[PDB]
Coordinates of C-alpha atoms and ligand atoms in Angstrom, one line a residue:
Chain A
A1 CA -5.3 -31.8 10.6
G2 CA -2.0 -32.1 8.6
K3 CA -1.7 -28.4 7.6
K4 CA 0.1 -25.3 8.8
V5 CA -1.5 -21.8 8.8
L6 CA 0.2 -18.4 9.3
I7 CA -2.1 -15.5 10.2
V8 CA -0.3 -12.1 9.4
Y9 CA -2.4 -9.7 11.5
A10 CA -2.3 -5.9 11.4
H11 CA -4.4 -4.2 14.1
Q12 CA -3.3 -2.2 17.2
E13 CA -6.2 -3.3 19.5
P14 CA -6.7 -6.8 20.7
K15 CA -10.4 -6.0 21.5
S16 CA -11.2 -4.7 18.0
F17 CA -13.3 -6.5 15.4
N18 CA -10.1 -7.4 13.6
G19 CA -8.9 -9.0 16.7
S20 CA -12.0 -11.0 17.1
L21 CA -11.7 -12.2 13.5
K22 CA -8.0 -13.3 14.1
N23 CA -9.0 -15.0 17.4
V24 CA -11.8 -16.9 15.9
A25 CA -9.4 -18.1 13.1
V26 CA -7.0 -19.3 15.7
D27 CA -9.8 -21.0 17.8
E28 CA -11.4 -22.8 14.8
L29 CA -8.2 -23.8 13.0
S30 CA -6.7 -25.0 16.4
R31 CA -9.9 -27.1 16.9
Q32 CA -9.4 -28.7 13.6
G33 CA -6.0 -29.8 14.7
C34 CA -4.0 -27.5 12.4
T35 CA -0.8 -25.9 13.3
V36 CA -1.3 -22.1 13.7
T37 CA 1.1 -19.2 14.0
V38 CA 0.2 -15.5 14.2
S39 CA 2.5 -12.7 13.3
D40 CA 1.1 -9.8 15.3
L41 CA 2.8 -7.0 13.5
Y42 CA 2.1 -4.0 15.8
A43 CA 2.8 -6.0 18.9
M44 CA 6.1 -7.0 17.3
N45 CA 6.8 -3.3 16.5
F46 CA 7.5 -4.9 13.0
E47 CA 9.9 -2.6 10.9
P48 CA 8.0 -1.5 7.7
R49 CA 10.8 0.6 6.1
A50 CA 12.9 -0.9 3.3
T51 CA 16.4 0.3 4.3
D52 CA 20.0 -0.7 4.1
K53 CA 19.7 -2.0 7.7
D54 CA 18.1 -5.0 6.2
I55 CA 21.4 -6.3 4.9
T56 CA 24.1 -7.1 7.3
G57 CA 26.9 -8.1 4.9
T58 CA 29.2 -6.3 2.4
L59 CA 27.0 -4.7 -0.2
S60 CA 27.3 -5.5 -3.9
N61 CA 27.3 -1.8 -4.7
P62 CA 28.0 0.4 -1.7
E63 CA 28.3 3.4 -4.0
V64 CA 24.7 3.4 -5.1
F65 CA 22.1 1.5 -2.9
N66 CA 19.4 -0.5 -4.8
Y67 CA 17.2 -2.2 -2.2
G68 CA 16.0 -5.0 -4.7
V69 CA 19.5 -6.0 -5.9
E70 CA 21.0 -5.8 -2.2
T71 CA 18.2 -7.9 -0.6
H72 CA 18.3 -10.5 -3.5
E73 CA 22.0 -10.9 -2.8
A74 CA 21.5 -10.8 0.9
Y75 CA 19.0 -13.7 0.7
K76 CA 21.2 -15.9 -1.4
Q77 CA 24.2 -15.2 1.1
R78 CA 22.0 -15.6 4.3
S79 CA 22.8 -12.0 5.4
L80 CA 19.4 -10.5 5.6
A81 CA 18.2 -9.0 8.9
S82 CA 16.8 -11.7 11.2
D83 CA 13.3 -10.2 11.5
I84 CA 12.9 -10.8 7.7
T85 CA 14.3 -14.4 7.9
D86 CA 12.1 -15.1 10.9
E87 CA 8.9 -14.2 8.8
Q88 CA 10.3 -16.2 5.7
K89 CA 10.6 -19.3 7.9
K90 CA 6.9 -18.9 8.9
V91 CA 5.8 -18.4 5.3
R92 CA 8.0 -21.3 4.0
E93 CA 6.4 -23.7 6.5
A94 CA 2.8 -22.6 6.0
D95 CA 0.3 -24.2 3.7
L96 CA -2.1 -21.2 4.0
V97 CA -1.3 -17.6 4.8
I98 CA -4.3 -15.5 6.0
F99 CA -3.9 -11.8 6.1
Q100 CA -6.1 -10.1 8.7
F101 CA -6.4 -6.3 8.5
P102 CA -8.6 -3.3 8.2
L103 CA -8.5 -1.6 4.8
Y104 CA -6.4 1.6 4.9
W105 CA -6.6 3.7 1.8
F106 CA -8.0 0.8 -0.4
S107 CA -5.0 -1.3 0.6
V108 CA -3.2 -2.7 3.6
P109 CA -1.9 -0.7 6.6
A110 CA 1.7 0.4 6.1
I111 CA 3.0 -1.9 8.7
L112 CA 1.6 -4.8 6.5
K113 CA 2.8 -3.2 3.4
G114 CA 6.3 -3.2 4.8
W115 CA 5.9 -6.9 5.7
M116 CA 5.1 -7.5 2.0
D117 CA 7.9 -5.2 0.8
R118 CA 10.6 -6.7 3.1
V119 CA 9.7 -10.4 3.5
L120 CA 8.8 -11.2 -0.1
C121 CA 12.2 -10.5 -1.5
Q122 CA 13.7 -11.9 -4.8
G123 CA 15.1 -15.3 -4.3
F124 CA 12.7 -16.2 -1.6
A125 CA 9.1 -15.3 -3.0
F126 CA 9.9 -14.9 -6.8
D127 CA 12.9 -15.0 -9.2
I128 CA 13.3 -13.9 -12.8
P129 CA 11.9 -16.1 -14.3
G130 CA 9.8 -17.7 -11.5
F131 CA 6.8 -15.4 -11.0
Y132 CA 3.1 -15.4 -11.4
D133 CA 2.1 -19.1 -11.9
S134 CA 5.9 -20.0 -11.6
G135 CA 6.4 -18.0 -8.5
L136 CA 8.5 -19.6 -5.7
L137 CA 5.5 -19.8 -3.2
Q138 CA 3.7 -22.1 -5.6
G139 CA 1.7 -24.7 -3.8
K140 CA 0.7 -22.4 -1.0
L141 CA -2.7 -20.7 -0.5
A142 CA -3.3 -17.2 0.6
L143 CA -6.5 -15.4 1.7
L144 CA -7.2 -11.7 2.4
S145 CA -9.5 -11.1 5.4
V146 CA -10.4 -7.4 5.2
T147 CA -12.6 -5.2 7.2
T148 CA -13.9 -1.9 5.8
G149 CA -15.4 1.4 7.0
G150 CA -17.5 1.6 3.6
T151 CA -20.7 -0.4 3.4
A152 CA -21.1 -3.3 0.9
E153 CA -23.3 -1.1 -1.3
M154 CA -20.6 1.7 -1.5
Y155 CA -18.2 -1.2 -2.8
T156 CA -20.2 -2.0 -5.9
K157 CA -19.5 -1.1 -9.5
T158 CA -22.1 1.7 -9.4
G159 CA -21.4 2.6 -5.8
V160 CA -19.0 5.5 -4.8
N161 CA -16.0 3.3 -4.1
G162 CA -16.4 1.0 -7.1
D163 CA -16.5 -2.7 -6.8
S164 CA -14.5 -4.3 -3.9
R165 CA -12.6 -6.5 -6.3
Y166 CA -11.0 -3.4 -7.8
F167 CA -8.8 -2.6 -4.8
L168 CA -8.0 -6.3 -4.5
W169 CA -5.9 -6.3 -7.7
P170 CA -2.5 -5.0 -6.4
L171 CA -2.7 -7.4 -3.5
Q172 CA -4.1 -10.6 -4.9
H173 CA -2.6 -10.3 -8.3
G174 CA 0.3 -8.0 -8.1
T175 CA 1.7 -9.5 -4.8
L176 CA 0.2 -12.9 -3.9
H177 CA -0.2 -14.4 -7.5
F178 CA 3.0 -12.8 -8.5
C179 CA 4.7 -14.9 -5.7
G180 CA 3.1 -18.1 -6.8
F181 CA 0.3 -18.3 -4.4
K182 CA -3.1 -19.6 -5.4
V183 CA -5.6 -17.1 -3.9
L184 CA -8.7 -18.1 -2.0
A185 CA -11.8 -15.8 -2.2
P186 CA -11.4 -12.8 0.1
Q187 CA -13.3 -12.6 3.2
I188 CA -14.7 -9.0 3.3
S189 CA -16.4 -7.9 6.6
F190 CA -18.1 -4.7 5.6
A191 CA -18.6 -1.7 7.8
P192 CA -18.5 -3.3 11.2
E193 CA -18.3 -0.1 13.1
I194 CA -21.7 0.9 11.6
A195 CA -23.2 -2.6 12.2
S196 CA -25.2 -3.6 15.3
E197 CA -23.8 -5.8 18.0
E198 CA -25.7 -8.8 16.6
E199 CA -24.5 -8.0 13.1
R200 CA -20.9 -8.0 14.2
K201 CA -21.4 -11.3 16.0
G202 CA -22.9 -12.7 12.7
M203 CA -19.9 -11.6 10.8
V204 CA -17.3 -13.3 13.2
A205 CA -19.4 -16.4 13.2
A206 CA -19.8 -16.4 9.4
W207 CA -15.9 -16.3 9.2
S208 CA -15.6 -19.2 11.8
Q209 CA -18.1 -21.1 9.8
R210 CA -16.3 -20.5 6.6
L211 CA -13.1 -21.8 8.2
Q212 CA -14.7 -25.1 9.0
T213 CA -14.5 -26.0 5.4
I214 CA -11.7 -23.9 4.2
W215 CA -9.6 -26.9 3.0
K216 CA -12.3 -27.9 0.6
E217 CA -12.2 -24.6 -1.3
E218 CA -10.8 -24.0 -4.6
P219 CA -8.9 -20.8 -5.5
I220 CA -10.1 -17.9 -7.7
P221 CA -9.0 -17.6 -11.2
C222 CA -6.7 -14.5 -10.3
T223 CA -7.1 -12.7 -13.7
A224 CA -8.0 -9.3 -14.9
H225 CA -11.5 -10.6 -15.8
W226 CA -12.2 -11.8 -12.3
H227 CA -11.2 -8.5 -10.9
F228 CA -12.7 -6.0 -13.4
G229 CA -15.2 -7.9 -15.8
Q230 CA -15.1 -7.7 -19.7
Chain B
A1 CA 3.4 32.5 -9.6
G2 CA 2.6 32.4 -6.8
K3 CA 2.3 28.6 -6.3
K4 CA 3.6 26.2 -3.7
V5 CA 4.7 22.6 -4.4
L6 CA 5.3 19.7 -1.8
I7 CA 7.3 16.8 -3.3
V8 CA 6.9 13.7 -1.0
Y9 CA 9.8 11.6 -1.9
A10 CA 10.4 7.9 -1.0
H11 CA 13.7 6.6 -2.1
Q12 CA 16.8 5.5 -0.1
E13 CA 19.5 6.6 -2.5
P14 CA 20.2 10.2 -3.5
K15 CA 22.0 8.8 -6.7
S16 CA 19.1 6.9 -7.9
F17 CA 16.8 7.5 -10.9
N18 CA 14.1 8.5 -8.4
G19 CA 16.5 11.0 -6.8
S20 CA 17.3 12.5 -10.2
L21 CA 13.6 12.9 -11.0
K22 CA 13.1 14.6 -7.6
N23 CA 16.1 16.8 -8.1
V24 CA 15.0 17.9 -11.6
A25 CA 11.6 18.7 -10.3
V26 CA 13.2 20.9 -7.5
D27 CA 15.4 22.5 -10.1
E28 CA 12.7 23.3 -12.7
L29 CA 9.9 24.3 -10.3
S30 CA 12.4 26.5 -8.4
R31 CA 13.5 28.1 -11.7
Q32 CA 9.9 28.9 -12.5
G33 CA 9.7 30.8 -9.2
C34 CA 7.6 28.4 -7.4
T35 CA 7.8 27.7 -3.6
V36 CA 9.2 24.2 -3.3
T37 CA 9.4 21.8 -0.2
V38 CA 10.7 18.2 -0.2
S39 CA 9.6 15.6 2.4
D40 CA 12.5 13.2 2.1
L41 CA 10.8 10.3 3.9
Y42 CA 13.8 7.9 4.4
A43 CA 16.1 10.7 5.4
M44 CA 13.5 11.8 7.9
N45 CA 13.3 8.2 9.2
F46 CA 9.6 8.9 8.8
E47 CA 7.4 6.6 11.0
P48 CA 5.1 4.5 8.9
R49 CA 3.1 2.7 11.7
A50 CA -0.3 3.9 12.7
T51 CA -0.1 3.8 16.5
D52 CA -1.3 5.4 19.6
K53 CA 2.0 7.4 19.7
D54 CA 0.4 9.5 17.0
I55 CA -1.9 11.2 19.6
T56 CA -0.3 13.3 22.4
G57 CA -2.0 13.7 25.8
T58 CA -5.2 11.8 26.9
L59 CA -7.0 9.4 24.4
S60 CA -10.7 9.9 23.6
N61 CA -11.1 6.2 24.5
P62 CA -8.1 4.6 26.3
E63 CA -9.7 1.1 26.9
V64 CA -10.4 0.3 23.2
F65 CA -8.1 2.0 20.7
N66 CA -9.6 3.1 17.4
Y67 CA -7.0 4.8 15.3
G68 CA -9.4 6.6 12.9
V69 CA -11.6 8.0 15.8
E70 CA -8.6 8.9 17.9
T71 CA -6.9 10.7 15.1
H72 CA -10.0 12.4 14.0
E73 CA -10.5 13.7 17.6
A74 CA -6.8 14.6 17.8
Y75 CA -6.8 16.7 14.7
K76 CA -9.9 18.7 16.0
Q77 CA -8.0 19.1 19.4
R78 CA -4.6 20.0 17.9
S79 CA -3.1 17.0 19.6
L80 CA -1.6 15.0 16.8
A81 CA 2.1 14.1 17.0
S82 CA 4.5 16.8 15.6
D83 CA 5.7 14.7 12.6
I84 CA 2.1 14.4 11.4
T85 CA 1.3 18.1 12.0
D86 CA 4.5 19.1 10.3
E87 CA 3.4 17.2 7.1
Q88 CA -0.2 18.5 7.3
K89 CA 1.2 22.1 7.3
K90 CA 3.2 21.3 4.2
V91 CA 0.1 19.8 2.4
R92 CA -2.3 22.6 3.6
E93 CA 0.0 25.2 2.1
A94 CA 0.7 23.4 -1.1
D95 CA -1.1 24.0 -4.5
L96 CA 0.5 20.8 -6.0
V97 CA 1.7 17.6 -4.2
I98 CA 4.1 15.5 -6.3
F99 CA 4.7 11.9 -5.0
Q100 CA 7.9 10.5 -6.2
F101 CA 8.6 6.8 -5.7
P102 CA 9.5 3.4 -7.1
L103 CA 6.5 1.0 -7.4
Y104 CA 6.7 -1.7 -4.7
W105 CA 4.1 -4.4 -5.1
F106 CA 1.9 -2.4 -7.5
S107 CA 1.7 0.4 -4.9
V108 CA 3.8 2.9 -2.9
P109 CA 6.7 1.7 -0.6
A110 CA 5.6 1.2 2.9
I111 CA 7.2 4.4 4.3
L112 CA 5.0 6.4 1.8
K113 CA 2.0 4.3 2.5
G114 CA 2.6 5.3 6.1
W115 CA 2.6 9.0 5.3
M116 CA -0.8 8.5 3.5
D117 CA -2.2 6.6 6.5
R118 CA -1.0 9.0 9.2
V119 CA -1.1 12.4 7.4
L120 CA -4.3 12.1 5.5
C121 CA -6.5 11.8 8.7
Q122 CA -10.3 12.4 9.0
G123 CA -10.9 16.2 9.4
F124 CA -7.8 17.2 7.5
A125 CA -8.1 15.3 4.3
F126 CA -11.7 14.2 4.4
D127 CA -14.8 14.2 6.5
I128 CA -18.5 13.4 6.7
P129 CA -19.2 15.1 4.5
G130 CA -16.3 16.1 2.3
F131 CA -15.0 13.3 0.1
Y132 CA -14.2 12.6 -3.5
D133 CA -15.1 15.7 -5.5
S134 CA -15.8 17.5 -2.1
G135 CA -12.7 16.1 -0.3
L136 CA -11.1 18.6 1.9
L137 CA -8.0 19.1 -0.1
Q138 CA -10.1 20.2 -3.0
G139 CA -8.5 23.0 -5.1
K140 CA -5.1 21.1 -4.8
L141 CA -3.5 19.1 -7.6
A142 CA -1.8 15.9 -7.0
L143 CA 0.5 13.9 -9.2
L144 CA 2.1 10.3 -9.0
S145 CA 5.6 10.1 -10.5
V146 CA 6.2 6.4 -10.4
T147 CA 9.1 4.3 -11.6
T148 CA 8.6 0.7 -12.4
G149 CA 10.8 -2.5 -12.8
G150 CA 8.2 -3.8 -15.3
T151 CA 8.2 -2.6 -18.9
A152 CA 5.3 -0.6 -20.6
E153 CA 4.3 -3.8 -22.6
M154 CA 4.0 -5.8 -19.4
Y155 CA 1.7 -3.0 -18.2
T156 CA -1.0 -3.4 -20.9
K157 CA -4.5 -4.9 -20.4
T158 CA -3.5 -8.3 -21.8
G159 CA 0.1 -8.1 -20.6
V160 CA 1.3 -10.0 -17.5
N161 CA 0.9 -7.1 -15.2
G162 CA -2.5 -5.6 -16.6
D163 CA -2.8 -2.0 -17.6
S164 CA -1.0 0.5 -15.3
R165 CA -4.2 2.2 -14.6
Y166 CA -5.4 -0.8 -12.8
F167 CA -2.8 -0.5 -10.0
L168 CA -3.3 3.4 -10.0
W169 CA -7.0 3.0 -8.7
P170 CA -6.3 2.8 -4.9
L171 CA -3.8 5.6 -5.1
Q172 CA -5.4 8.0 -7.6
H173 CA -9.0 7.2 -6.8
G174 CA -9.1 5.7 -3.4
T175 CA -6.6 8.1 -1.8
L176 CA -6.0 11.4 -3.8
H177 CA -9.6 11.8 -5.3
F178 CA -11.1 10.7 -2.2
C179 CA -9.3 13.5 -0.3
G180 CA -10.5 16.0 -3.0
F181 CA -7.3 16.4 -5.1
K182 CA -7.6 16.9 -8.8
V183 CA -5.3 14.3 -10.2
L184 CA -3.0 15.2 -12.9
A185 CA -2.0 12.4 -15.3
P186 CA 0.5 10.2 -13.6
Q187 CA 4.1 10.4 -14.7
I188 CA 5.1 6.8 -15.3
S189 CA 8.8 6.2 -15.9
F190 CA 8.8 2.6 -17.2
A191 CA 11.8 0.3 -16.4
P192 CA 14.6 2.8 -15.9
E193 CA 17.3 0.2 -14.6
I194 CA 17.5 -1.7 -17.9
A195 CA 17.4 1.4 -20.1
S196 CA 20.4 3.3 -21.5
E197 CA 22.3 5.8 -20.4
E198 CA 20.5 8.1 -22.8
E199 CA 16.8 6.9 -22.7
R200 CA 17.1 7.6 -19.0
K201 CA 18.8 11.1 -19.4
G202 CA 15.7 11.4 -21.6
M203 CA 12.8 10.2 -19.3
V204 CA 14.3 12.8 -16.9
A205 CA 14.0 15.4 -19.6
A206 CA 10.4 14.4 -20.5
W207 CA 9.7 15.1 -16.9
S208 CA 11.6 18.4 -16.6
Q209 CA 9.8 19.4 -19.9
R210 CA 6.4 18.3 -18.6
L211 CA 7.0 20.3 -15.5
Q212 CA 7.5 23.6 -17.7
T213 CA 3.8 23.5 -18.4
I214 CA 2.4 21.8 -15.4
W215 CA 0.1 24.6 -14.3
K216 CA -1.7 24.5 -17.8
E217 CA -2.9 20.9 -17.2
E218 CA -6.4 19.8 -16.7
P219 CA -7.0 17.0 -14.0
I220 CA -8.0 13.6 -15.4
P221 CA -11.6 12.4 -14.8
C222 CA -10.8 10.2 -11.8
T223 CA -13.4 7.5 -12.6
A224 CA -13.8 3.8 -12.7
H225 CA -14.2 4.2 -16.4
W226 CA -10.8 6.1 -16.8
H227 CA -9.1 3.3 -14.8
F228 CA -10.8 0.2 -16.2
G229 CA -13.1 1.1 -19.1
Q230 CA -12.8 1.6 -22.8
Ligands
FAD1 C1 -5.9 5.4 7.6 C2 -7.2 4.7 7.6 C3 -7.6 4.5 6.3 C4 -8.8 3.9 6.1 N1 -9.1 3.8 4.7 C5 -10.3 3.1 4.4 C6 -10.5 2.7 3.1 O1 -9.8 3.0 2.1 N2 -11.8 2.2 2.7 C7 -12.7 1.9 3.8 O2 -13.8 1.4 3.6 N3 -12.3 2.1 5.1 C8 -11.2 2.7 5.4 N4 -10.9 3.0 6.8 C9 -11.8 2.5 7.9 C10 -11.3 1.1 8.5 O3 -11.1 0.2 7.3 C11 -12.3 0.5 9.4 O4 -12.4 1.5 10.5 C12 -11.9 -0.9 9.9 O5 -12.1 -1.6 8.8 C13 -12.9 -1.3 11.0 O6 -12.3 -2.4 11.6 P1 -11.9 -2.5 13.2 O7 -11.4 -3.8 13.6 O8 -10.9 -1.3 13.5 O9 -13.4 -2.1 13.7 P2 -13.8 -2.0 15.3 O10 -14.0 -0.4 15.5 O11 -12.8 -2.6 16.2 O12 -15.1 -2.8 15.3 C14 -16.4 -2.4 15.3 C15 -16.9 -2.8 16.7 O13 -17.0 -4.2 16.8 C16 -16.7 -4.6 18.1 N5 -16.4 -6.0 18.1 C17 -15.1 -6.5 18.3 N6 -15.2 -7.8 18.4 C18 -16.6 -8.2 18.3 C19 -17.2 -9.4 18.5 N7 -16.7 -10.6 18.7 N8 -18.6 -9.4 18.4 C20 -19.3 -8.2 18.3 N9 -18.6 -7.0 18.2 C21 -17.3 -7.0 18.2 C22 -15.7 -3.7 18.7 O14 -16.0 -3.6 20.0 C23 -16.1 -2.4 17.9 O15 -16.9 -1.5 18.7 C24 -9.6 3.6 7.1 C25 -9.3 3.8 8.5 C26 -8.0 4.4 8.7 C27 -7.7 4.6 10.2
FAD2 C1 9.4 -4.6 -2.9 C2 9.8 -4.2 -4.2 C3 8.7 -4.3 -4.8 C4 8.6 -4.0 -6.1 N1 7.5 -4.2 -6.7 C5 7.3 -3.9 -8.0 C6 6.1 -3.9 -8.7 O1 5.1 -4.2 -8.2 N2 6.0 -3.7 -10.1 C7 7.1 -3.3 -10.8 O2 7.1 -3.0 -12.0 N3 8.4 -3.1 -10.2 C8 8.5 -3.4 -8.8 N4 9.7 -3.2 -8.2 C9 10.9 -2.7 -8.9 C10 10.9 -1.1 -8.7 O3 9.7 -0.5 -9.0 C11 12.0 -0.4 -9.5 O4 13.2 -1.2 -9.1 C12 12.3 1.0 -9.5 O5 11.1 1.6 -9.8 C13 13.5 1.5 -10.3 O6 13.6 2.9 -10.0 P1 15.0 3.3 -9.1 O7 15.2 4.8 -8.9 O8 15.0 2.4 -7.8 O9 16.1 2.9 -10.2 P2 17.7 3.2 -10.2 O10 18.4 1.8 -10.2 O11 18.1 4.1 -9.0 O12 18.1 3.9 -11.6 C14 18.3 3.1 -12.7 C15 19.7 3.6 -13.2 O13 19.6 4.9 -13.6 C16 20.6 5.6 -12.9 N5 20.3 7.1 -12.8 C17 20.1 7.9 -11.7 N6 19.8 9.1 -12.2 C18 19.9 9.2 -13.5 C19 19.6 10.3 -14.4 N7 19.8 11.5 -14.0 N8 19.6 10.0 -15.8 C20 19.9 8.7 -16.2 N9 20.1 7.7 -15.3 C21 20.1 7.9 -13.9 C22 20.8 4.8 -11.6 O14 21.9 5.1 -10.7 C23 20.7 3.4 -12.3 O15 21.9 2.9 -12.9 C24 9.8 -3.6 -6.8 C25 11.1 -3.3 -6.1 C26 11.1 -3.6 -4.8 C27 12.4 -3.5 -4.1
YTR3 C1 -9.8 7.2 7.2 O1 -11.0 6.6 6.7 C2 -11.3 6.4 5.5 C3 -10.4 6.5 4.4 C4 -10.8 6.2 3.1 C5 -12.0 5.7 2.8 C6 -12.5 5.4 1.4 C7 -11.4 5.6 0.3 C8 -13.8 4.9 1.0 C9 -14.6 4.7 2.2 O2 -15.9 4.2 2.0 N1 -14.3 5.0 3.6 C10 -15.4 4.7 4.6 C11 -13.1 5.5 3.9 C12 -12.6 5.8 5.2 O3 -13.5 5.7 6.2 C13 -14.2 6.8 6.9
YTR4 C1 10.4 -7.1 -5.6 O1 10.4 -6.9 -7.1 C2 9.2 -6.9 -7.8 C3 8.0 -7.1 -7.2 C4 6.9 -7.2 -8.0 C5 6.8 -7.0 -9.3 C6 5.6 -7.1 -10.2 C7 4.3 -7.3 -9.4 C8 5.7 -6.9 -11.5 C9 6.9 -6.6 -12.1 O2 7.0 -6.5 -13.4 N1 8.2 -6.6 -11.5 C10 9.5 -6.4 -12.1 C11 8.1 -6.8 -10.0 C12 9.4 -6.7 -9.2 O3 10.6 -6.5 -9.8 C13 11.9 -6.4 -9.2
ZN5 ZN1 -3.7 -13.0 -10.5
ZN6 ZN1 -11.5 9.1 -8.7

């Protein structure tokens, strides 16, 4: 009701549990009067590879390609590929960025990892200095909404997988806090394929219900202690 | 003697520090008489997206697409896409898989995340049962050779980045251990771009020297305690 939300969504099947979670977020944030945009990466055939195709201008060093140096220069010159600048405009305008995905290998699907690698370039999301609490997306909120195959109990300190917060570190800390975001507590929807039809319904509703009051939430302290203890 | 090694390499520029690390690994392992294969993912234009193109012929469930179910059934029915099956043949023959990459957002570059997501499928790399210590690639060694932009000091427990071990978790534990690899100690080449000249010529030589005795190494204990503990 005076806020813009971007949902960066990474699932191939609109009928999936991820699809239901993205759709309930759109329904409830639209109901509240928020402005909502969804980047549906598979439907966009979003390019995940970091390549020299991402810079259209004269390179700074055409003899030895360095993706970080070339994209930083490209951002400043306005010569990055348009798919990257299209996503940067959505991020720049958003007050909250929700990432909706299934956990692949304790991380994001590669199509979403390529969104982070290509969209969050130096100059746009961070600079040196200008990272962690001084990152360039300061003032914005981010939230990971993850689904898993593993049950909640597998994702505890003494379960097989270790605590769920452990796999969050490179994403919440190394990526989102690095860029200046404040991080809202993650939404983790555990083992929906194993769960009953009513259980999956309960998890979709629980997310809808959380979104009713998302603007009242405060972010986590995105530190080593929150993630690991000690 | 006799041993086979697969190097999965993820850098765009053959003249890079990563390139030099890959090329010294080829040179030294070939000198020792080992069988060496290199999957040069950018040069291959390797597909990182997990999509229904990864299954050939008719889908187990063509109304509701589930990548993990479809690719498990496809592996069993020898109907995965040829780029995937080509890589699984390389991994199946290998005794040691070396991943050579620059760290992107505390993790692998998306093109390499896509190799993990699409080659390490259920039935090939893991199953019920057959994970962690009993993963299906048990008997094989895996090793991360990672370059960073951050310095070793930045990568300490109280440093801005946290201990390196913290970002290694989803890769060493959640991916390589999970599939049954014994994980050799990562090779972490901290902050090459800012180093001399020498120092660099030298981190290459620590790696070539390490590789002289790689078959004598014992695997790390791939535990939460190794990654996070004291
Ligand atoms: C490469 C790969 C790597 C993986 N790595 C990991 C990992 O590291 N750790 C881990 O724990 N897991 C991992 N997984 C498993 C993956 O995380 C889960 O399969 C995924 O999280 C489940 O989400 P989904 O949307 O695909 O579930 P779905 O299979 O779509 O959802 C379960 C069921 O919910 C139903 N559903 C959809 N909407 C609703 C609704 N509104 N109400 C009721 N039911 C509904 C669907 O019809 C479906 O039958 C991996 C999978 C792959 C393919
Ligand atoms: C999206 C993105 C995300 C990133 N995220 C992170 C992150 O999370 N954390 C982090 O720490 N860093 C991050 N980085 C930085 C990245 O990890 C480093 O830039 C990379 O690791 C440096 O290795 P390189 O091969 O690319 O270096 P190069 O620049 O290719 O090498 C450094 C220098 O050594 C030269 N060289 C080549 N071969 C040799 C040799 N034989 N002997 C001596 N010198 C040689 C090179 O040409 C160059 O001058 C990120 C970069 C990008 C683009
Ligand atoms: C491809 O599927 C995968 C891949 C990896 C995992 C991991 C690392 C932990 C886990 O609990 N589950 C369920 C997984 C899974 O689901 C079967
Ligand atoms: C895109 O580039 C990036 C992206 C991320 C990092 C992080 C998380 C820590 C770090 O120390 N450095 C240097 C980084 C970097 O450097 C260029
Ligand atoms: Zn943090
Ligand atoms: Zn482990």
